[PDB]
Amino acid sequence: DMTCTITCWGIGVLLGIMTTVGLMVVGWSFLQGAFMGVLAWLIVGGVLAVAVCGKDNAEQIRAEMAAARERVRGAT
């Protein structure tokens, strides 16, 4: 599922560009906006990749997989 991670990284890059342009609009300079945009890229891209792409596809496999770990625990 590397494609979803690459999509999240691209979304983060686009969000960084948008935030940079917005910071130009507010009244900052190029580098001041660029630094905050890069921050936003890395933070939001990492968060989305860990969270959204961590929801691997499963409908009934997830429940028994969740239930299986509920049995290993409680006796260890």
User: Between residues 25 and 70, which has the closer beta carbon with respect to another protein?
Assistant: 70
Contact residue for another protein among 9, 24, 28, 38 (CB under 8 A): 28
25 belongs to the binding site for another protein (CB under 8 A)? no
67 belongs to the binding site for another protein (CB under 8 A)? yes
Contact residue for another protein among 6, 39, 43, 62 (CB under 8 A): 62
Distances (CA, A) of 71 to 18, 28, 61, 63, 68: 48, 56, 16, 12, 5
Residue 20 · residue 37 · CB < 8 Å = yes
What is the contact surface with another protein in residues (CB under 8 A)? 2, 28-29, 31-32, 35, 51, 62-63, 66-67, 70, 73-76
